[PDB]
Structure formats: C-alpha cells, structure tokens
Amino acid sequence: SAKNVVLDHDGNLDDFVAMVLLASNTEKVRLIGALCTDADCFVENGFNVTGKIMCLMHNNMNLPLFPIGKSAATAVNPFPKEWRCLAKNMDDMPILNIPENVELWDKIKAENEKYEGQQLLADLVMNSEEKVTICVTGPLSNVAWCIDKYGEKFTSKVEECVIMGGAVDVRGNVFLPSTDGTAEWNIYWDPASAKTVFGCPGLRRIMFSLDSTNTVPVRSPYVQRFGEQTNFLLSILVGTMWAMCTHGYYAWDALTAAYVVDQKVANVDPVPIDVVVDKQPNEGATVRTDAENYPLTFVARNPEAEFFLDMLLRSARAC
Amino acid sequence: SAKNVVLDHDGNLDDFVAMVLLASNTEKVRLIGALCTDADCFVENGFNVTGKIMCLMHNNMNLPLFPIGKSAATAVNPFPKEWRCLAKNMDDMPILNIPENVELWDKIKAENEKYEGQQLLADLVMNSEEKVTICVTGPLSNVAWCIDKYGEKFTSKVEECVIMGGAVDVRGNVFLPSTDGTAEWNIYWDPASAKTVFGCPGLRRIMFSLDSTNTVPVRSPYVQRFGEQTNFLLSILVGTMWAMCTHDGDGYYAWDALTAAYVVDQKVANVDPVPIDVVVDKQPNEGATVRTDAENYPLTFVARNPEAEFFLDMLLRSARAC
Ligand SMILES: Nc1nccc2c1ncn2[C@@H]1O[C@H](CO)[C@@H](O)[C@H]1O
Ligand SMILES: Nc1nccc2c1ncn2[C@@H]1O[C@H](CO)[C@@H](O)[C@H]1O
Ligand SMILES: [Ca+2]
Ligand SMILES: [Ca+2]
C-alpha cells in the first residue's frame, strides 16, 4: 500500500507542482500532512494556496484531507522578495478559486491555522504507526528543529528525508554581491539548520541538489502539452504555474517529489555532506567532508528525465 | 450594428484583457484587425498570443478571423526588460494551447506573418466601406506612421482614436535616474510619434491618461471572482492574466482594459477637451503630455471620472462569452 509522506515546503511554484504530484499518486503516496515556511513565499499566501489545492483535489478525486501548518521558522538569509510573491499570484488564479472548493477551505481553515508547523511535523512523524517519508522542498529549518528537540525519538521514526537542496559537484544558484555562487538557496536560507540535518546520525537523507535538478529544465514545448489536457483541472493548474517560470527555471521541487513517488526517477550515491555556516562568500555551500565517521547522504545523480516528465503529464490528468 | 475596430497594442497583460473585451462584445464591436508592437513585450510572443486568443474565440463563439500584423516600429526609449517578458509566459498557458485552436492558428499563421504592422493598419482603415475606430494600448508609433505616410487619406477614414497613454493633471509612471516622473510609459516609448498624433487636426482622439486609469486598480477580491466562471475559457484566461498582476505599492492597474471598455461603451467615462502637446526634447520630462497654448491647436478628449463599477461588471460579463 501507499507510504506516509509529509511535505515540508516554502510555497513557490515548483513547491506546488511537487504537492500535486504527491497528492495525485494515491496508489504510491498517502499524503498525511503538509507545512509551509515563510521562505520563498509569504507563508500566509503559501498556506492558503496549499489549502486551496488540497480542496480542489479533494472535491474532484480520491484524496483525504490532511493537516496543513504554518512553520514559525525564521530566515538567516531571506529569498529575494521578487520570487516570494509568487504564492500571492497563485492565490488569485481562477482554477484555485472555484466557490465549492474555496467554500470547503473556509470551513476547515480554523482547524489548520491552529497548528504550528514545526510541532506538527514532529507529531505527524512520531505518532505514525508506519515510518514517514518527509519531502523537503524548502529550507531545512523544520527537520532541524525536530532533530534538536526530539533527536533519536524523531529520526528513528523517519523512513527517509528526500531533500531538494545544495550543489555538490556543480555551481550553486545563490548569486549576490556577497557570495561566490557556490551555494544553493534552500541551504543558504538557513545554513545552521542544514548543517544539523546533513550531519545527523541515524537519519537517511536523499538529496536532490543542483547536480540532478539542472538536468531537467522548464521547456515551452513540454509546458504546452498541458494544453492537450485542459479538461483536467490539474493540467490547467500545473501548466499555468510552469507558464510563469519558462522565459533559468528548473523543476527543482517537482523532480524531488517525483522520486518519493517512484525511486526509478534516479539512483542515489553516498557522500559525506557538511555545510558552511560562516559568514563568508560561500556561506550555505554543501561540501564533501572526509572527517572521520561522518554520516552519508545519498546524492541523486543522472535523473530519468523522460520518466519524470511523463509521470507529471499523466499525474496532471488525475482530475 | 457593430462598428469597425482595430486594436493597436504592445502585448502586455492588460493589452490582452483589452483584446478580449473588444472581441467578446460582438454586438458593439467588429474587430477587423490587430497589430502588435515590440514595446512592452517581444513582438513575436505578442503576435502568437494574439493569434492564439483569436483562434480560441473563433472556435468557441464565432469571432470572425482577422489579419494580425507585426509593427516594424522601434523604440526611442525602451520599456523595462522585466515587463516585456510577459507575452512570453502567456504563450505557454494551457488555455491558449488547446490542439484545435493551435491547429487553426498554425494554419493561418504564415499569411498573417506576412503583413507589415503599420501598412496593415493603413489598409484596414482606408479600405473599409465604413469608418474605423482605432484602439491604441501601446505606443503611438503606428498611427503616427500612417498619418505621416497617408495624411488625410488615412485620418478621414478614422472614426476616432481611443488611446491609452499620458498623464495630464497627475504624475506619470516613468521613473528613471534621468527623468522627473511626469511622463507616462506609452508616450515616453516614442514621444515624436505621440506629438504627431496629438497635434493632428481632422483626427478625433479620446485619451485615457493616468488621470482616469489611476481610479480603477487591480484588486484580489475582484480577480478571484473569475473563479466563479471557470466553465468559461475567457474567465480562465482573463482571471489568470490579472492573477499575475496582483503584487507596499500601487503596482498594476487596468490601463488598457479601461481604454477598450470605452470603445465598447462610452458610458465608461465623460471626456474633457484639452489641447495636448508632447515633450520630445531630451529633457527630464521627455514624453510628458502637456497643455499647449498654441492657437487653433486640435483638441483631445481626455477621460474623466470613469465609471469603475460599470467597468468591472462589463469585464466579468464579457468574460462569460465563452
Ligand atoms: N528563480 C529562482 N532561482 C532559484 C531558486 C528558486 C527560484 N524560484 C524558486 N526557487 C526555489 O529555490 C529552491 C531551489 O534552489 C527550490 O526549492 C525552489 O522553490
Ligand atoms: N508595471 C508597469 N508600470 C507601468 C506601465 C506598465 C506596467 N506593466 C505594463 N505597463 C503598460 O504601460 C502602459 C501604461 O502606462 C499600458 O499600455 C500597459 O500595457
Ligand atoms: Ca521550494
Ligand atoms: Ca499596453
């Protein structure tokens, strides 16, 4: 049967496509909850879009409602405000504002806005009968908060943490006048938390760094294929989000969520991953460490691109 | 009976909302052509989005096809590289890429690709048995070319020019290190062409400067109402384009939409006659639309106190035409 999955995201466009993938593959994934972080989005918008997507799907296909929580995590190095506003735009898109669907969200909103994201992640993981796979598409602040507070009690409950983040053998994507371009954004947002997660013993981590995600870019011809499926709400939703990315833009979080759905997406290789926490040009960089007895992270490599793109197009036909 | 109308735009998000407004109101308007200018968009993209929207409406509400041409016009002062890229994102929207509509467009794209934007505008107006109303939502370069090239043979055929542009009694929106913020972007893109248009006698002009567009901003509650009409392709279309405009600041308005709304129904706003000249000298206020003292100076009818509720209701209704 399907495995338990919690999505820990920061509400940008690819975070939502990742959400769709997880929630539309009911045979492989049982999405038991989600949390949104005020990183690459303003959490109130990220929170509402999460809920609106969950209700549109729930009212049109097989998908049990699940808890959604706002994480109190705060930034160390914030995302450029320009990219963050994207959840706001999504929040106003017609396909996410069908009355019957918004109506549902309005009735269940009170319950969900009561949860605190980090504590909800700890609870969903620990109180689960089966182990829980965590799909992290935003910064690692939340998995770190759980580790710092419950240690082995939390980590022993995690099936595996499938993380979108870092740059191992390729350049990063954090280009500011104070950085050298070796770091990737999710790690850079909160380096200390990333260090805690990558250096945590007894936690299995799958890592989709820029090494894998650079090989699956957002391309117009493929994006137009969603036009062949306008009869499906999800194809209108997914095609519309990627239309705002194509112009530089990758399916970062989507590919990552695709792996949680089906491991065929990519093979993973063991690498001791440490994180630069100092205020230097390479702050947030993910580097190999040969330090004695350091935990091994399984880096994804050479992703099956066609397999992924096909998985997404077909999944966007769930409803 | 509908009146002939040609849309002269530059492919930004409101230009396309304006296009839908014009085309969807077939009772009041018969859209006989459109041209895209490489201004606040990249012409090729503006061109295809224009064609995909036309075809989609053709196969869903019987909107007669019409020639679409690319303007050869070039900038004097380029639009910010940031905004121009939007006609690009719209080109990949699922709603504009339905196979049947893409097929039709791919068929007729070669012949429309043949037209020269400026000449197309001249011919559509001069070869019409009835006069033609021109809706300009981009720079004034194309109407100016036609005036210069054909003069009275052209203007005498123009019912009226309804233009989105300028700022008369309020500040502009062009803020660069070298400007003073008094000019508006469409005029600033090509001041000389604008001067030509506003000074031309024998041509009737309706002007939607920021004075009127400032009074009808893009707000979330309203945009979300398009979600009440997802069974209409045009509501998915218009609702998505404006969803991209809901950003602290004032940001986006419905500049080009309000302008086309007037072409559909003059009830949209009252107009005031004002002699308008354009600053073409490379001064800080370059591109500013100013009141001139010249004698016998042709008057331009500036929009005042637009009916905001009337407009919002017109757009929501027009979007349910299919
Ligand atoms: N323009 C952009 N550049 C880099 C990263 C971006 C981005 N827009 C969103 N992201 C996010 O940053 C993380 C990838 O570096 C992803 O999880 C993704 O959501
Ligand atoms: N952010 C922005 N600021 C100013 C003008 C803008 C804009 N985005 C688009 N425009 C365009 O500017 C002209 C309005 O000033 C309109 O025709 C419209 O298409
Ligand atoms: Ca993300
Ligand atoms: Ca325009």
XYZ file of C-alpha atoms and ligand atoms in Angstrom:
681
model
C 0.000 0.000 0.000
C 0.965 3.702 -0.189
C 3.592 5.131 2.169
C 3.122 8.037 4.583
C 4.514 11.340 3.361
C 4.605 14.804 4.855
C 5.516 17.705 2.533
C 7.689 20.464 4.106
C 7.678 23.312 1.557
C 8.098 27.050 1.171
C 5.361 27.754 -1.352
C 6.979 28.705 -4.613
C 5.724 27.409 -7.977
C 7.720 24.192 -8.047
C 6.705 23.502 -4.416
C 3.072 23.386 -5.524
C 3.762 21.180 -8.537
C 5.542 18.857 -6.080
C 2.391 18.945 -3.952
C 0.220 17.993 -6.923
C 2.498 15.037 -7.776
C 2.346 13.701 -4.195
C -1.405 14.189 -3.827
C -2.330 12.768 -7.251
C -0.436 9.480 -6.927
C -2.724 7.980 -4.353
C -1.535 4.421 -5.114
C 2.090 5.149 -4.178
C 1.700 8.061 -1.752
C -0.531 8.791 1.192
C -0.027 12.474 1.952
C -0.681 12.813 5.688
C 0.135 16.450 6.126
C 1.991 19.497 4.902
C 3.699 22.520 6.399
C 4.549 25.808 4.725
C 7.526 28.006 5.537
C 7.788 31.761 5.044
C 10.978 31.283 2.982
C 10.449 31.546 -0.782
C 6.908 32.784 -0.184
C 4.963 34.798 2.329
C 3.600 31.946 4.454
C 0.028 33.265 4.635
C -0.224 33.005 0.828
C 1.706 29.736 0.771
C -0.610 28.421 3.469
C -3.805 29.439 1.571
C -2.613 28.039 -1.783
C -1.779 24.754 -0.093
C -5.294 24.626 1.268
C -6.925 25.674 -1.993
C -5.033 22.994 -3.925
C -5.923 20.353 -1.321
C -9.613 21.294 -1.588
C -9.738 21.433 -5.402
C -8.235 17.929 -5.484
C -10.301 16.572 -2.593
C -13.554 17.721 -4.245
C -12.604 16.067 -7.534
C -10.700 12.874 -6.821
C -9.525 10.391 -4.212
C -7.675 12.455 -1.587
C -8.328 12.525 2.159
C -7.963 15.949 3.760
C -4.781 16.374 5.782
C -3.467 18.918 8.271
C -1.620 21.995 6.991
C 0.533 24.025 9.365
C 2.411 27.291 9.227
C 6.010 26.998 10.377
C 7.413 29.628 12.720
C 10.854 29.149 11.147
C 12.638 32.462 10.565
C 15.268 33.207 7.905
C 19.019 33.690 8.266
C 19.382 34.822 4.646
C 15.993 35.623 3.020
C 14.978 34.843 -0.567
C 14.731 37.852 -2.901
C 11.276 39.358 -2.288
C 10.666 39.257 -6.033
C 10.338 35.438 -6.119
C 8.444 35.147 -2.837
C 5.342 36.981 -4.080
C 4.536 34.059 -6.399
C 2.210 32.288 -3.916
C 0.231 35.551 -3.856
C -0.347 35.372 -7.601
C -1.357 31.711 -7.357
C -3.754 32.569 -4.567
C -5.737 34.653 -7.089
C -5.729 32.242 -10.051
C -9.222 31.262 -11.204
C -8.690 27.479 -11.114
C -7.952 27.767 -7.372
C -10.946 29.904 -6.590
C -13.916 27.781 -7.668
C -16.587 28.561 -4.984
C -17.295 24.939 -3.946
C -13.581 24.456 -3.354
C -12.979 27.745 -1.540
C -16.110 27.067 0.483
C -14.553 23.853 1.763
C -11.291 25.627 2.623
C -13.200 28.288 4.560
C -14.872 25.643 6.745
C -11.681 23.729 7.556
C -9.369 26.721 7.850
C -9.882 27.337 11.589
C -8.579 23.889 12.467
C -5.460 24.157 10.325
C -4.478 27.697 11.245
C -4.193 26.455 14.858
C -1.240 24.110 14.157
C 2.329 25.310 14.482
C 4.254 23.875 11.539
C 7.390 22.561 13.241
C 5.489 20.924 16.080
C 3.020 19.461 13.562
C 5.878 17.854 11.587
C 7.273 16.299 14.785
C 3.825 14.926 15.696
C 2.941 13.563 12.251
C 6.247 11.719 12.128
C 6.460 10.382 15.700
C 2.778 9.396 16.225
C 2.597 7.482 12.922
C 2.258 3.677 13.079
C 4.345 3.328 9.930
C 7.521 5.279 9.184
C 7.129 8.618 7.456
C 8.955 9.883 4.405
C 9.490 13.632 4.560
C 9.663 15.520 1.256
C 11.514 18.811 1.953
C 11.264 21.363 -0.864
C 12.008 24.454 1.186
C 14.782 25.124 3.786
C 15.785 22.519 6.379
C 14.833 24.667 9.402
C 11.923 22.380 10.329
C 13.614 18.982 10.174
C 16.475 20.580 12.156
C 14.053 21.937 14.792
C 12.649 18.413 15.187
C 16.105 16.862 15.483
C 17.281 19.438 18.016
C 14.194 18.764 20.155
C 13.429 15.049 19.862
C 16.662 13.643 18.478
C 16.534 9.872 18.155
C 12.790 9.908 19.012
C 12.109 11.767 15.744
C 14.909 10.476 13.481
C 14.202 6.843 14.275
C 10.646 7.459 13.038
C 11.701 8.872 9.669
C 11.676 6.495 6.716
C 13.844 8.937 4.778
C 14.122 12.651 4.196
C 14.014 13.406 0.468
C 15.530 16.873 0.227
C 15.718 19.426 -2.565
C 18.827 21.455 -1.870
C 22.544 22.013 -2.218
C 25.087 21.871 -5.015
C 27.758 19.163 -4.701
C 29.822 18.934 -7.886
C 28.236 21.825 -9.778
C 27.946 25.554 -9.148
C 25.206 26.888 -6.848
C 22.457 29.389 -7.694
C 22.858 31.944 -4.918
C 24.380 34.911 -6.733
C 24.611 38.038 -4.625
C 27.351 40.679 -4.349
C 28.440 38.971 -1.106
C 28.541 35.379 -2.316
C 30.740 33.366 -4.636
C 27.916 31.412 -6.282
C 28.757 28.039 -4.735
C 25.654 27.772 -2.536
C 22.092 26.804 -3.391
C 19.129 28.804 -1.992
C 17.347 26.397 0.386
C 20.588 25.677 2.272
C 21.673 29.307 2.080
C 18.341 30.458 3.624
C 19.348 28.711 6.881
C 22.868 27.162 6.887
C 22.935 26.162 10.554
C 19.731 24.088 10.247
C 21.106 22.410 7.102
C 24.311 21.524 8.989
C 22.236 19.917 11.722
C 20.310 17.795 9.244
C 23.167 16.686 6.990
C 25.368 15.841 9.962
C 22.663 13.917 11.820
C 23.449 10.238 12.516
C 20.676 7.699 12.042
C 18.695 9.740 9.517
C 18.521 8.563 5.910
C 18.722 11.546 3.556
C 18.158 11.535 -0.195
C 19.482 14.755 -1.709
C 18.354 16.356 -4.937
C 20.960 19.080 -5.300
C 21.525 21.203 -8.400
C 23.588 18.249 -9.768
C 20.362 16.409 -10.584
C 17.884 19.267 -10.958
C 19.983 21.093 -13.598
C 19.288 18.201 -15.980
C 15.529 18.774 -16.087
C 14.789 22.389 -17.221
C 11.333 24.015 -17.716
C 10.743 23.936 -21.534
C 7.974 25.656 -23.515
C 7.101 22.728 -25.845
C 6.553 20.350 -22.936
C 4.658 23.015 -20.998
C 2.340 23.492 -23.957
C 1.453 19.799 -23.772
C -0.736 20.685 -20.793
C -2.946 22.404 -23.364
C -3.888 18.967 -24.715
C -5.409 18.346 -21.288
C -7.442 21.472 -20.416
C -10.279 19.146 -19.472
C -8.323 18.274 -16.335
C -8.238 20.868 -13.575
C -4.762 19.719 -12.586
C -3.382 20.277 -16.081
C -4.765 23.816 -16.054
C -3.140 24.290 -12.651
C 0.235 22.765 -13.432
C 0.522 24.209 -16.923
C -0.368 27.662 -15.646
C 2.292 27.605 -12.899
C 5.080 26.487 -15.203
C 4.000 29.068 -17.764
C 5.111 31.677 -15.229
C 8.534 30.022 -14.942
C 9.547 29.433 -18.587
C 11.273 32.513 -20.002
C 16.767 29.973 -15.766
C 13.975 27.987 -14.101
C 14.059 24.285 -13.206
C 11.515 21.757 -11.929
C 13.604 21.560 -8.721
C 10.953 20.569 -6.174
C 8.826 18.620 -8.652
C 11.643 16.214 -9.581
C 12.332 15.765 -5.855
C 8.700 14.894 -5.136
C 8.780 12.640 -8.227
C 11.476 10.488 -6.525
C 9.257 9.993 -3.435
C 6.543 8.729 -5.814
C 8.880 6.374 -7.694
C 12.571 5.694 -6.999
C 13.116 4.903 -10.688
C 13.387 8.702 -11.004
C 17.102 8.423 -10.051
C 19.849 6.338 -8.454
C 21.470 7.809 -5.362
C 25.131 7.833 -4.294
C 26.610 8.129 -0.775
C 28.525 11.322 0.007
C 29.511 12.811 3.434
C 27.819 16.236 3.303
C 28.797 19.175 5.520
C 27.563 22.774 5.349
C 29.455 26.107 5.505
C 27.909 28.175 8.289
C 30.395 31.055 8.444
C 29.651 34.494 7.080
C 31.952 34.053 4.100
C 31.318 34.244 0.318
C 30.499 30.510 0.260
C 28.025 30.559 3.180
C 25.490 27.741 2.767
C 27.651 25.695 0.436
C 27.301 21.900 0.630
C 30.750 20.317 0.548
C 32.136 16.819 0.866
C 33.811 16.106 4.176
C 36.210 13.236 4.770
C 36.024 13.830 8.513
C 36.167 10.533 10.375
C 32.846 8.696 10.782
C 30.655 11.403 9.185
C 27.063 10.423 8.168
C 26.442 9.531 4.480
C 23.908 11.469 2.362
C 22.560 9.760 -0.779
C 23.006 12.232 -3.589
C 20.714 11.789 -6.584
C 22.502 11.676 -9.955
C 21.592 11.375 -13.658
C 17.778 11.596 -13.241
C 15.465 9.823 -15.667
C 14.122 12.980 -17.348
C 11.566 11.459 -19.741
C 10.280 9.203 -16.997
C 9.696 12.263 -14.791
C 8.090 14.431 -17.454
C 5.778 11.571 -18.319
C 4.929 10.969 -14.693
C 3.936 14.632 -14.345
C 1.823 14.886 -17.508
C -0.117 11.721 -16.638
C -0.500 12.697 -12.962
C -1.907 16.065 -14.053
C -4.782 14.034 -15.505
C -5.961 12.689 -12.130
C -8.667 15.380 -12.166
C -24.834 47.177 -35.882
C -21.253 46.884 -34.603
C -18.588 49.425 -35.539
C -15.281 48.570 -37.199
C -12.407 48.400 -34.702
C -8.676 47.742 -34.957
C -6.596 47.008 -31.845
C -3.093 48.576 -31.894
C -1.310 47.013 -28.919
C 2.045 46.005 -27.479
C 1.261 42.676 -25.857
C 1.360 43.240 -22.110
C -1.219 41.661 -19.765
C -3.741 44.496 -19.918
C -3.346 44.721 -23.715
C -4.662 41.155 -23.875
C -7.510 41.844 -21.447
C -8.372 44.753 -23.724
C -8.277 42.445 -26.717
C -10.750 40.082 -25.061
C -13.050 42.950 -24.112
C -13.134 44.197 -27.687
C -13.546 40.802 -29.359
C -16.092 39.414 -26.884
C -18.558 42.293 -27.368
C -19.511 41.438 -30.970
C -22.737 43.444 -30.688
C -20.948 46.761 -30.181
C -17.667 45.797 -31.848
C -16.472 44.118 -35.019
C -12.729 43.609 -34.586
C -11.318 43.728 -38.124
C -7.625 43.596 -37.299
C -4.875 43.876 -34.727
C -1.177 44.682 -34.712
C 1.478 44.045 -32.085
C 4.444 46.288 -31.445
C 7.756 45.194 -29.939
C 7.240 47.537 -26.973
C 6.263 46.260 -23.507
C 6.618 42.770 -24.956
C 8.664 40.851 -27.502
C 6.677 41.185 -30.725
C 6.926 37.521 -31.791
C 5.362 36.464 -28.495
C 2.744 39.207 -28.547
C 1.963 38.111 -32.094
C 1.376 34.420 -31.241
C -0.603 35.132 -28.081
C -2.721 37.478 -30.197
C -3.274 34.705 -32.716
C -3.986 32.013 -30.102
C -6.571 34.174 -28.384
C -8.246 34.972 -31.724
C -8.425 31.325 -32.789
C -9.727 30.195 -29.396
C -12.564 32.702 -29.633
C -13.231 31.766 -33.248
C -13.805 28.104 -32.392
C -15.903 28.885 -29.337
C -18.133 31.877 -30.052
C -17.689 32.501 -33.773
C -15.493 35.570 -33.784
C -14.653 36.238 -37.456
C -10.927 35.777 -38.060
C -8.959 38.936 -38.828
C -5.459 39.786 -40.051
C -2.817 40.328 -37.375
C 0.389 42.171 -38.184
C 3.702 42.912 -36.513
C 4.748 46.535 -36.400
C 8.186 47.435 -37.700
C 8.171 50.330 -35.205
C 11.246 50.633 -32.974
C 11.671 52.375 -29.611
C 13.090 55.780 -28.771
C 13.120 54.833 -25.078
C 12.719 51.055 -24.363
C 10.245 49.579 -21.840
C 11.841 47.875 -18.795
C 13.186 44.450 -19.847
C 11.232 42.959 -16.920
C 7.657 43.608 -18.129
C 8.174 42.797 -21.804
C 8.675 39.117 -20.960
C 5.018 38.561 -20.047
C 3.716 37.968 -23.597
C 6.178 35.075 -23.378
C 4.665 33.389 -20.348
C 1.128 33.740 -21.777
C 2.266 31.832 -24.863
C 2.596 28.668 -22.759
C -0.663 28.973 -20.832
C -2.697 25.714 -21.122
C -5.845 27.623 -22.085
C -4.179 29.119 -25.158
C -2.725 25.833 -26.293
C -5.745 23.633 -26.953
C -4.929 21.468 -30.053
C -7.892 22.546 -32.214
C -7.083 26.225 -31.633
C -3.348 25.751 -32.076
C -4.013 23.903 -35.359
C -6.110 26.699 -36.844
C -3.544 29.282 -35.752
C -0.666 27.232 -37.174
C -2.532 27.094 -40.466
C -3.210 30.833 -40.838
C -0.005 31.968 -39.118
C 2.034 32.102 -42.340
C -0.252 34.601 -44.107
C -0.618 36.871 -41.058
C 3.126 36.616 -40.545
C 3.405 38.235 -43.993
C 1.771 41.572 -43.055
C 3.697 44.695 -42.100
C 2.047 46.115 -38.976
C 1.976 49.773 -39.933
C 0.819 49.198 -43.536
C -1.816 46.745 -42.310
C -3.251 49.492 -40.111
C -3.287 51.920 -43.040
C -5.046 49.449 -45.379
C -7.643 48.288 -42.862
C -8.745 51.879 -42.273
C -8.562 53.085 -45.875
C -10.191 50.042 -47.482
C -13.159 49.972 -45.089
C -16.512 50.935 -46.542
C -17.320 52.269 -43.089
C -15.080 54.324 -40.793
C -12.783 52.584 -38.343
C -12.169 53.191 -34.648
C -8.545 52.558 -33.566
C -7.871 51.310 -30.011
C -4.254 52.120 -29.147
C -2.988 50.463 -25.965
C 0.656 50.546 -26.943
C 2.867 53.451 -28.150
C 1.558 55.834 -30.821
C 4.215 54.960 -33.421
C 1.866 53.169 -35.840
C -0.938 55.730 -36.028
C 1.818 58.377 -36.468
C 3.396 56.432 -39.326
C 0.000 56.225 -41.063
C -0.625 59.942 -40.601
C 2.840 60.776 -41.962
C 2.595 58.331 -44.872
C -1.030 58.888 -45.947
C -2.311 62.018 -44.213
C -5.955 62.879 -44.844
C -6.452 59.753 -46.970
C -5.948 57.959 -43.665
C -7.407 60.240 -40.961
C -10.650 60.945 -42.868
C -11.306 57.211 -42.594
C -10.806 57.179 -38.803
C -13.965 57.358 -36.728
C -11.886 58.122 -33.638
C -8.635 57.177 -31.976
C -9.090 55.825 -28.427
C -5.686 55.942 -26.778
C -4.243 54.622 -23.529
C -1.400 56.991 -22.643
C -0.183 60.163 -20.971
C -0.679 61.974 -17.673
C -2.310 65.422 -17.698
C -3.087 66.609 -14.175
C -1.273 63.857 -12.305
C 2.238 62.419 -12.147
C 3.464 59.919 -14.723
C 4.859 56.442 -14.148
C 8.216 56.703 -15.901
C 10.767 56.883 -13.076
C 14.398 56.660 -14.225
C 17.506 58.405 -12.845
C 17.272 60.863 -15.740
C 13.522 61.620 -15.590
C 11.296 63.675 -13.269
C 8.379 61.227 -13.140
C 5.922 63.367 -15.163
C 5.776 61.203 -18.323
C 3.713 58.066 -18.916
C 5.298 54.948 -20.473
C 3.435 54.568 -23.805
C 4.195 58.175 -24.787
C 7.741 58.021 -23.429
C 8.438 54.967 -25.637
C 8.099 57.169 -28.713
C 7.482 60.884 -27.943
C 7.727 62.183 -31.534
C 5.090 59.742 -32.787
C 2.901 60.859 -29.894
C 3.365 64.541 -30.782
C 2.359 63.770 -34.346
C -0.829 62.066 -33.168
C -1.943 64.657 -30.573
C -1.298 67.603 -32.895
C -3.055 66.116 -35.929
C -6.269 68.007 -36.854
C -9.003 66.084 -38.643
C -8.364 63.186 -36.253
C -10.667 62.662 -33.257
C -8.851 61.456 -30.069
C -10.213 60.030 -26.797
C -7.455 59.949 -24.169
C -7.225 57.667 -21.168
C -4.278 59.183 -19.334
C -3.306 58.044 -15.826
C -5.772 60.645 -14.565
C -8.555 58.152 -15.238
C -6.688 54.810 -15.151
C -5.425 55.678 -11.652
C -9.000 55.363 -10.385
C -9.578 51.679 -11.205
C -6.804 49.456 -9.654
C -6.281 45.652 -9.880
C -7.549 44.047 -6.599
C -7.570 40.403 -5.428
C -11.207 40.030 -4.269
C -12.325 41.083 -7.759
C -9.798 38.962 -9.655
C -10.840 35.879 -7.667
C -14.404 36.312 -8.894
C -13.228 34.916 -12.222
C -13.011 31.670 -10.328
C -16.808 31.749 -10.236
C -16.693 31.294 -14.031
C -14.121 28.572 -14.733
C -16.523 26.942 -17.198
C -15.822 29.890 -19.495
C -12.469 29.788 -21.255
C -12.311 33.589 -21.247
C -12.679 33.747 -17.471
C -9.825 31.280 -17.069
C -7.882 33.473 -19.490
C -8.602 36.934 -18.076
C -8.516 35.724 -14.469
C -5.093 34.167 -14.974
C -3.615 37.249 -16.667
C -4.679 39.505 -13.848
C -3.695 36.978 -11.188
C -0.196 37.711 -12.466
C -0.758 41.452 -11.721
C -1.682 41.325 -8.014
C 1.687 42.188 -6.412
C 3.572 48.224 -0.379
C 2.801 49.868 -3.715
C 0.023 50.566 -6.230
C 1.716 48.467 -8.896
C -0.739 47.376 -11.574
C -3.945 48.873 -12.909
C -6.278 48.022 -15.762
C -4.866 50.760 -18.029
C -5.532 49.094 -21.402
C -8.700 47.379 -20.219
C -10.462 50.611 -19.191
C -9.444 52.080 -22.534
C -11.040 49.290 -24.603
C -14.092 49.342 -22.324
C -14.783 52.848 -23.580
C -14.720 51.619 -27.202
C -17.372 49.079 -26.192
C -19.487 51.664 -24.316
C -18.739 55.395 -23.990
C -20.725 55.207 -20.736
C -17.367 54.219 -19.252
C -16.357 57.883 -18.893
C -17.028 61.580 -19.503
C -14.416 63.417 -21.595
C -12.902 66.895 -21.433
C -11.412 68.719 -24.449
C -7.747 69.625 -23.918
C -5.049 70.787 -26.357
C -2.259 68.208 -25.947
C 1.356 68.550 -26.998
C 4.221 66.159 -26.216
C 7.678 66.944 -24.866
C 10.105 65.422 -27.367
C 13.282 67.206 -26.283
C 15.619 65.035 -24.207
C 14.597 66.761 -21.005
C 13.737 65.138 -17.661
C 10.045 65.391 -18.602
C 10.608 63.892 -22.050
C 7.401 62.166 -23.143
C 5.153 64.285 -20.933
C 1.737 65.196 -22.323
C 1.247 68.905 -21.668
C -1.460 71.504 -22.171
C -0.338 73.757 -25.026
C -1.012 77.460 -25.584
C -0.886 77.312 -29.381
C -3.813 78.912 -31.226
C -6.080 76.700 -33.345
C -4.478 73.717 -31.585
C -6.523 70.499 -32.140
C -8.371 69.299 -29.034
C -8.048 65.832 -27.498
C -10.839 64.440 -25.329
C -9.374 63.363 -22.015
C -11.241 60.737 -19.952
C -12.501 61.914 -16.538
C -14.139 60.182 -13.577
C -14.522 56.742 -15.151
C -17.393 54.528 -14.001
C -15.361 51.920 -12.081
C -18.195 49.602 -11.062
C -19.619 49.785 -14.583
C -16.253 48.705 -15.977
C -15.606 45.860 -13.526
C -19.093 44.486 -14.250
C -18.541 44.789 -18.013
C -15.317 42.773 -17.828
C -16.775 39.962 -15.701
C -19.746 39.702 -18.083
C -17.687 39.857 -21.288
C -15.520 37.024 -19.935
C -18.573 34.758 -19.927
C -18.939 34.992 -23.734
C -17.235 31.574 -23.938
N 14.256 31.982 -9.604
C 14.669 31.089 -8.709
N 16.023 30.832 -8.594
C 16.484 29.925 -7.688
C 15.762 29.176 -6.816
C 14.385 29.438 -6.940
C 13.768 30.357 -7.834
N 12.372 30.357 -7.680
C 12.181 29.463 -6.729
N 13.353 28.852 -6.219
C 13.425 27.798 -5.155
O 14.719 27.555 -4.597
C 14.856 26.137 -4.268
C 15.821 25.737 -5.411
O 17.097 26.373 -5.351
C 13.640 25.380 -4.825
O 13.118 24.619 -3.735
C 12.702 26.472 -5.413
O 11.361 26.559 -4.924
N 4.417 47.801 -14.221
C 4.033 48.651 -15.168
N 4.207 50.016 -14.956
C 3.822 50.913 -15.901
C 3.249 50.653 -17.116
C 3.070 49.255 -17.337
C 3.422 48.218 -16.443
N 3.096 46.953 -16.989
C 2.565 47.241 -18.165
N 2.504 48.616 -18.472
C 1.940 49.213 -19.735
O 2.023 50.616 -19.667
C 1.027 51.350 -20.419
C 0.518 52.055 -19.144
O 1.414 53.006 -18.548
C -0.065 50.302 -20.667
O -0.430 50.267 -22.051
C 0.476 48.939 -20.182
O 0.371 47.821 -21.056
Ca 10.870 25.367 -2.721
Ca -0.029 48.274 -23.373
